[PDB]
């Protein structure tokens, strides 16, 4: 079995490190059993998206296993919303970079 160390922030946020691409690009994610989709901030994110400024961004040009989809997505969580576009790549757990 693979152990994924989780970081605890104020008993409110539990997140662990993952990898997207070849070579893996590191990102911290919430392993949410209440949702069924994987998403990370894109490098092609809007300048208006401030959250993007202080968070890791996926760059498809730096990955060799990246497969383009392009299909637009729209997620609505109780707390917030996000939209973007679909992509396909290799997901490493833990990061392994």
């Amino acid at each position: 079995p693979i152990p994924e160390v989780l970081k605890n922030y104020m008993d409110a946020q539990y997140y662990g490190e993952i990898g997207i691409g070849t070579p893996p690009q590191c990102f911290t994610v919430v392993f949410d059993t209440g949702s069924s989709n994987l998403w990370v901030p894109s490098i092609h994110c809007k300048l208006l998206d401030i959250a993007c400024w202080i968070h890791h961004k996926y760059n498809s040009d730096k990955s060799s296993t990246y497969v383009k989809n392009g299909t637009s997505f729209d997620i609505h969580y109780g707390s917030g919303s996000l939209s973007g576009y679909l992509s396909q790549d290799t997901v490493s757990v833990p990061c392994q970079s």
Partner: protein
Amino acid sequence: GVKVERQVFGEATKQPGITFIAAKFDGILGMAYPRISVNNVLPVFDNLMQQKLVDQNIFSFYLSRDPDAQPGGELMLGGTDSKYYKGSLSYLNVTRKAYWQVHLDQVEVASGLTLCKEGCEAIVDTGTSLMVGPVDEVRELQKAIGAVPLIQGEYMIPCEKVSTLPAITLKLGGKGYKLSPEDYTLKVSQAGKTLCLSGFMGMDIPPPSGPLWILGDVFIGRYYTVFDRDNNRVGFAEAA
């Protein structure tokens, strides 16, 4: 580690609000069923399953409630970490394969109050920090535990009264899952001031999905949770 080949994911370009500015994580890796997947994308674990990358198609969660313990938690892909739980796992069958949905027999308050008396449906959610229940039912609960409303369905308890509080038992699969007041209350400190946040939140989940109770990190914190995909069930143990 493990490598999940040919995984479809979303590259977020717009994150309106403040929700994600505040957040310490970069994204979300959903682990519920493919039914609740946006644009019916095959989720990470379902792909990891299909690619036979694990022997057992199960995943475990240990969440530390210190909070500053090192590590602060663990996700075990393809098994269960015995060093983080006490006794044996007690399994509950998943009622609807969308969320990790189980039947909740009752919500018991030691002092007297019974809620969800005829039985309800609950979801085991790692992306929720508190316990969630219907607005009216949770309103009864906090009147019963002397808590007062703050804002956005959140209630606060005087810290001097936390000692005196009653336990809250959740009847799942016939067994009883007690939460002592120290389990269901959060000592929130800010600008050199301490408040005690009730681990119970009032929120109405609309149908067809709802009504639903949510067993968040407050629950999973006190009870090591196991998510079985081969047998479609959720197992619980006392966290160590």
